[PDB]
Amino acid sequence: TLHNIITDTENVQGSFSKHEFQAETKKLLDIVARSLYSEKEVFIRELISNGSDALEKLRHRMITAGGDTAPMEIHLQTDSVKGTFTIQDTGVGMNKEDLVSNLGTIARSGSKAFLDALQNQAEASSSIIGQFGVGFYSAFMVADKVEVYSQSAEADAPGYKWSSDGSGVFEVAEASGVRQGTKIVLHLKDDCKEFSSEDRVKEVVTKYSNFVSFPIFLNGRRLNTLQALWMMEPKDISEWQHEEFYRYVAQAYDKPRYTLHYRADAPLNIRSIFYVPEMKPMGSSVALYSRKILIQTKATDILPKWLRFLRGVVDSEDIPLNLSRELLQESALIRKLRDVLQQRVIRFLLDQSKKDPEKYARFFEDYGLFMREGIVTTGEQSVKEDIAKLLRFESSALPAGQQTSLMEYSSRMKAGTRNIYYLCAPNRHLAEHSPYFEAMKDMEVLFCFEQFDELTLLHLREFDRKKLISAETRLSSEQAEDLLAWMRNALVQRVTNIKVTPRLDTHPAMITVLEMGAARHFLRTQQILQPTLEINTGHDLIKKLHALKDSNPELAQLLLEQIYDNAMIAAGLNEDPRPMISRLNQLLTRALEK
Amino acid sequence: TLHNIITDTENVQGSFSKHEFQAETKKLLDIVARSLYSEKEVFIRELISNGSDALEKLRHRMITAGAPMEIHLQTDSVKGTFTIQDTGVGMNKEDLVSNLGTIARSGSKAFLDALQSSSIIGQFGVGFYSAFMVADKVEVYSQSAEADAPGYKWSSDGSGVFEVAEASGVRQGTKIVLHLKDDCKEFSSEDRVKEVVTKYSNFVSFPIFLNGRRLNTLQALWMMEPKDISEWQHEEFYRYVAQAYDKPRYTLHYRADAPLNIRSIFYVPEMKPSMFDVSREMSVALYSRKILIQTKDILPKWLRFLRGVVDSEDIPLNLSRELLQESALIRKLRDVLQQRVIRFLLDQSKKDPEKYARFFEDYGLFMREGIVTTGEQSVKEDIAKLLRFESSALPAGQQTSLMEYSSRMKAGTRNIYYLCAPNRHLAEHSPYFEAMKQKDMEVLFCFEQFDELTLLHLREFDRKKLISAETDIVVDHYKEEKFQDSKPASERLSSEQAEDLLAWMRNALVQRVTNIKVTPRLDTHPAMITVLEMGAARHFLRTILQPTLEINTGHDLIKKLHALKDSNPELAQLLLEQIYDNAMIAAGLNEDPRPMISRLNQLLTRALE
Numbered sequence A: 001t002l003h004n005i006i007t008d009t010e011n012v013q014g015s016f017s018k019h020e021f022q023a024e025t026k027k028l029l030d031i032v033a034r035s036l037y038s039e040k041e042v043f044i045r046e047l048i049s050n051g052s053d054a055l056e057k058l059r060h061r062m063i064t065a066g067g068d069t070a071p072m073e074i075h076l077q078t079d080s081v082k083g084t085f086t087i088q089d090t091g092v093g094m095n096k097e098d099l100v101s102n103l104g105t106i107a108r109s110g111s112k113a114f115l116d117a118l119q120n121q122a123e124a125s126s127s128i129i130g131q132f133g134v135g136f137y138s139a140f141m142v143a144d145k146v147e148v149y150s151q152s153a154e155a156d157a158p159g160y161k162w163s164s165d166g167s168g169v170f171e172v173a174e175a176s177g178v179r180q181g182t183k184i185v186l187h188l189k190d191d192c193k194e195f196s197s198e199d200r201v202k203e204v205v206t207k208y209s210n211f212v213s214f215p216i217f218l219n220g221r222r223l224n225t226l227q228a229l230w231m232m233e234p235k236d237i238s239e240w241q242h243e244e245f246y247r248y249v250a251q252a253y254d255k256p257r258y259t260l261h262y263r264a265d266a267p268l269n270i271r272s273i274f275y276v277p278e279m280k281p282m283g284s285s286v287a288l289y290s291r292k293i294l295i296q297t298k299a300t301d302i303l304p305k306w307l308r309f310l311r312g313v314v315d316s317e318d319i320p321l322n323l324s325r326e327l328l329q330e331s332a333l334i335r336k337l338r339d340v341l342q343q344r345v346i347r348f349l350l351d352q353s354k355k356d357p358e359k360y361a362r363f364f365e366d367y368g369l370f371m372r373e374g375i376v377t378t379g380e381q382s383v384k385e386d387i388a389k390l391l392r393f394e395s396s397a398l399p400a401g402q403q404t405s406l407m408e409y410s411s412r413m414k415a416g417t418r419n420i421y422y423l424c425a426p427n428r429h430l431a432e433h434s435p436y437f438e439a440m441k442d443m444e445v446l447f448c449f450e451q452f453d454e455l456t457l458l459h460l461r462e463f464d465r466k467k468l469i470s471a472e473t474r475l476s477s478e479q480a481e482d483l484l485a486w487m488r489n490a491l492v493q494r495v496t497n498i499k500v501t502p503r504l505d506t507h508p509a510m511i512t513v514l515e516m517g518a519a520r521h522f523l524r525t526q527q528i529l530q531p532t533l534e535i536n537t538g539h540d541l542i543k544k545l546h547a548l549k550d551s552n553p554e555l556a557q558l559l560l561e562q563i564y565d566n567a568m569i570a571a572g573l574n575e576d577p578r579p580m581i582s583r584l585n586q587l588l589t590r591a592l593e594k
Numbered sequence B: 001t002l003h004n005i006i007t008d009t010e011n012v013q014g015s016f017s018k019h020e021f022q023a024e025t026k027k028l029l030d031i032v033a034r035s036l037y038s039e040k041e042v043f044i045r046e047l048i049s050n051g052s053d054a055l056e057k058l059r060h061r062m063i064t065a066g067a068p069m070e071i072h073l074q075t076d077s078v079k080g081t082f083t084i085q086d087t088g089v090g091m092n093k094e095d096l097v098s099n100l101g102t103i104a105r106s107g108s109k110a111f112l113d114a115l116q117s118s119s120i121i122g123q124f125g126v127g128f129y130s131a132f133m134v135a136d137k138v139e140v141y142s143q144s145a146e147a148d149a150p151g152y153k154w155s156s157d158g159s160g161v162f163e164v165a166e167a168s169g170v171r172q173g174t175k176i177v178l179h180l181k182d183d184c185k186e187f188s189s190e191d192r193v194k195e196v197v198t199k200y201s202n203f204v205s206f207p208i209f210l211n212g213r214r215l216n217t218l219q220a221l222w223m224m225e226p227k228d229i230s231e232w233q234h235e236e237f238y239r240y241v242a243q244a245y246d247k248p249r250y251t252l253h254y255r256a257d258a259p260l261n262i263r264s265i266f267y268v269p270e271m272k273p274s275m276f277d278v279s280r281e282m283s284v285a286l287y288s289r290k291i292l293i294q295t296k297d298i299l300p301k302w303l304r305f306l307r308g309v310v311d312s313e314d315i316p317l318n319l320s321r322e323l324l325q326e327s328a329l330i331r332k333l334r335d336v337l338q339q340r341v342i343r344f345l346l347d348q349s350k351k352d353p354e355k356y357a358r359f360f361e362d363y364g365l366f367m368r369e370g371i372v373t374t375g376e377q378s379v380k381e382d383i384a385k386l387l388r389f390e391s392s393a394l395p396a397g398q399q400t401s402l403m404e405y406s407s408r409m410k411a412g413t414r415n416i417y418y419l420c421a422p423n424r425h426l427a428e429h430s431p432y433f434e435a436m437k438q439k440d441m442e443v444l445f446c447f448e449q450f451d452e453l454t455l456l457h458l459r460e461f462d463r464k465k466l467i468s469a470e471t472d473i474v475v476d477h478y479k480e481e482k483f484q485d486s487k488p489a490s491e492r493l494s495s496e497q498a499e500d501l502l503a504w505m506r507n508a509l510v511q512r513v514t515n516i517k518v519t520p521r522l523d524t525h526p527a528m529i530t531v532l533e534m535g536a537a538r539h540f541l542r543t544i545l546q547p548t549l550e551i552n553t554g555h556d557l558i559k560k561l562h563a564l565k566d567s568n569p570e571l572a573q574l575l576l577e578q579i580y581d582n583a584m585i586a587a588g589l590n591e592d593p594r595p596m597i598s599r600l601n602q603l604l605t606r607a608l609e
């Protein structure tokens, strides 16, 4: 039933003309200045990056030719009456030939050419931002008209004025008195007048360009420029610099409880700092930077989903950037970086689990849901068991409240079998009285009390080739029976079985449950599943129950309901006993007729 | 105090040269191949889109006059090739050279302006070069219509040059062959190519065949007349967009042209949301024309339970066609959609209150979230309109709303009273309600566990302050409002017995309570705990509050306690401690009830003599 028409029918029956690829220049300018960025404000990022590059070239140049004590800075000026945005740097500037070439030609980058001639380990090779040759045209996004004044440091080269409206043509004339470097004046479109507002410019500068290495001034005022902590030696960073940097980078008001300052060079250059907040659960995630400039507020491809609880920053200088500079290209190197980072963070958290198990215990209670989620969603067994190292549970051999890893269980496994038995229960009381538990008379059972603990072990399957397997695979003798047959008569629509058990002392009764899909079904029903009473015939209230049933057919009932309800609370199946209170008050009142 | 260097000093000297912008073609080609599109797979979308446009041009050419218009895909694993062929209008030599041999030239842009339909996808003039993301050799065979035009083979590397020759066996339309480079062999996999078609091109308006088999392309339901869509078509479309197996309980098919173009459909699943899926964070797809535009940002966070699709011609596309421009435009779209969805949900409650009750039970958590996290009062109140409660002024819910409470308001009153309790019975016989019954105000009864928090965050509704019954009871102490006891003095403890009892209680509960007082406001309850900010206290207890213990000297239990302090004094202290615990539990201020059990059993044994 196939329908295909693709057929090898074509033969070239002629000569062979040869052409070169062309570019429609007019249209290309329109694209860059329109359908490139997601946001207009981004022209500021571009112009400042260009200023930085210009200064950085000048700094490189004065390593050999120096040295002027000329100051290296970027100035921004707003004029809200003329509707202009102006940016000036005191960098290397441009002569006439470099204005025509660099500005007049789309995709032509002088910074790229400058980078390509550097010794591969000169400092400028890491700090230069531009290489596409298009960012300057982002000015036409917001400006009807653009004027560039430029003075190069040269053979007393004259100053020059470049001007364009962005519609295919530009003018260049000689000028004075242009200061060494480059001044760019944007005559803003009516719809872009907001970029002649001081407060708005300031918002853009701090958003993208807050860690630019040269001083930024706006209307003669120094902006609050921060240090890119991630670029520095981890032992030149104090704990209290990390605290301030974290709050800034995470938009937080607490302190990091964990800090991982990670640096390396393969598969990519990476300078990064991760934080775990102290507070139990823009800057809602880890930010991506390249050469100290924001690429994405919320980095998408560099970390796994389950690690989204980390705050902080990743900076790579050779990460392949998309032309918009707000996305990353598809790369085997980005993929490897995510793998590398996943292991690095896992490794870091293990180490912390040893240094301070108590602090790690606190960490796990708060953020353990993410490990659980990670184990479930990632369909690769090798890493499921890498995330699983971070999990904690209680045990059938260890005291209540005390945590163990799978490792501390897998170690204590006898040479006999190679499979791990868990019992996922709402709490300790119910675990210790599971019939399935008592099957394990002698084997140790992991007690998994946390939400989705059952789900992860299901999705886990195996750990260290060991298998995860749910472990769910006085008063005479007729006085009791009479009382029993009587208790079954009032709890008809509630419990199923009323046993009698010789293992009670202070408690008159207790509730047990067989299968715990239903126990974890009740709750969360409230916003009736097979419970079982067990009676202590030695207890006074039970002995007081047996008698009163015939001496009081209106008061006893209260004593029965109460004993039942008290047992349900004791089992952790009723933590909001609001419904019993008024009744209990009736019981106490009727009891206290003395 | 200022440091500036920007001064108006620059003056033009002499004349000026005029210049035309230029372009560096080879680096441009490279930018398109390596830096333009985030994902390599997208060349399938770009080539299919070009095929769709060519078929529209031909369809429009063949309307003045009297072949099956289709797009064929073929994968050769052995040869490492990806092939696409459309039966479209084709290209002549001058077309191949000017349109394909020129970056940013768009024949599809010039065809449009020569109509003075809206089905043409291509405007940038660059989509075709996406092939060089995945291919180190591209051949193009094209036959124009009619036009007494010969066939042509276009071929490139593509770096700088391309050849153009005459070919003989060219079918009407265009065939393109990609010799896949080696890190891109996945695109000679049928299963892989198919994933991309259905991802980006699943609504193109011509049949697409892959290796001889027709792909299940769909109608763009959202662009069509709401009345022409059956319930069953919505069932199927829902399953596709939400990737689900159940059906929608509600369907909102929304169009609008002012203030912005909008073509959308939204669904609420019949299945309850997974609480795991709710906690973790993973929505709605965004489209232009009929091609998927990568994004999901469009709805406020509280409306993430919705599934379906949004299309708006007012969202312009970035060059890569995966990002959308105008971020404030989006906030407006988001505001419009939020407002429209609230209206829809309100109409659903009116139309079918039983069905809405099920919806509110399953999804209400989202509305409470939306109210708590929004900062705008009017948005919080808009969402609050969706909330449902019961009332003291109506039998068993019988679900009412804040608006309906407002309309029953008196002249008159400047407050909306509520009481949060876990069910209807407990509210009705709450000691806090017995106290409010002495007033003639209506009380909302709220049963969900996060209702309190929600109303605390809401604060007011339609300029009316929300006050919990518990709070109001405390404020009344400082208003010197007067109330009569529900029983006469004959069956209450005398004044002297009251204070005598109180001074004993204060001694027996020293660091546990601030005040202990008599209250004339209870009937069936012996006591209650009061705390001005009761709601905030309850919320704070999630892992001492200056509580007041108020007693009812008419209650037999309290009166009995008075007797016990001089009869069995030890028993009186155990009783007292139990009443306090009882009042704490009933106030919802207890911590963990288990350490009280053994204590309560000790109390029962002593009383049962």
Ligand SMILES: Nc1ncnc2c1ncn2[C@@H]1O[C@H](COP(=O)(O)OP(=O)(O)O)[C@@H](O)[C@H]1O
Binding pocket: A046, A050, A051, A054, A089, A091, A092, A093, A094, A102, A103, A108, A109, A110, A111, A112, A129, A130, A131, A132, A133, A134, A135, A136, A137, A181, A182
């Ligand atoms: N402020 C400036 N000072 C000196 N030269 C500049 C300045 N801005 C731009 N240039 C030159 O113009 C070229 C093009 O700028 P741009 O369009 O941003 O491309 P790139 O990606 O190379 O930065 C730069 O490579 C640089 O040579």
Ligand SMILES: Nc1ncnc2c1ncn2[C@@H]1O[C@H](COP(=O)(O)OP(=O)(O)O)[C@@H](O)[C@H]1O
Binding pocket: B046, B050, B051, B054, B086, B088, B089, B090, B091, B099, B100, B105, B106, B107, B108, B109, B121, B122, B123, B124, B125, B126, B127, B128, B129, B173, B174
């Ligand atoms: N399959 C095709 N059939 C006919 N013409 C085509 C085809 N593919 C491309 N073209 C022509 O080449 C031009 C450039 O295509 P493309 O690079 O996608 O830019 P755009 O599609 O945005 O115009 C198109 O405008 C169209 O005129």
Ligand code: BEF
Binding pocket: A046, A049, A129, A130, A131, A132, A133, A134, A135, A136
């Ligand atoms: F600033 Be360039 F275009 F990368």
Ligand code: BEF
Binding pocket: B046, B049, B121, B122, B123, B124, B125, B126, B127, B128
């Ligand atoms: F297909 Be075009 F590049 F919009």
Ligand SMILES: [Co+2]
Binding pocket: A008, A010, A011
């Ligand atoms: Co041949």
Ligand SMILES: [Co+2]
Binding pocket: A116, A117, A118, A119, A120
């Ligand atoms: Co080199």
Ligand SMILES: [Co+2]
Binding pocket: B008, B010, B011
């Ligand atoms: Co002037």
Ligand SMILES: [Co+2]
Binding pocket: B407, B408, B409, B410
């Ligand atoms: Co009225």
Ligand SMILES: [Mg+2]
Binding pocket: A046, A049, A050, A129, A130, A131, A133, A134, A135, A136
């Ligand atoms: Mg640049």
Ligand SMILES: [Mg+2]
Binding pocket: B046, B049, B050, B122, B123, B126, B127, B128
């Ligand atoms: Mg196209």
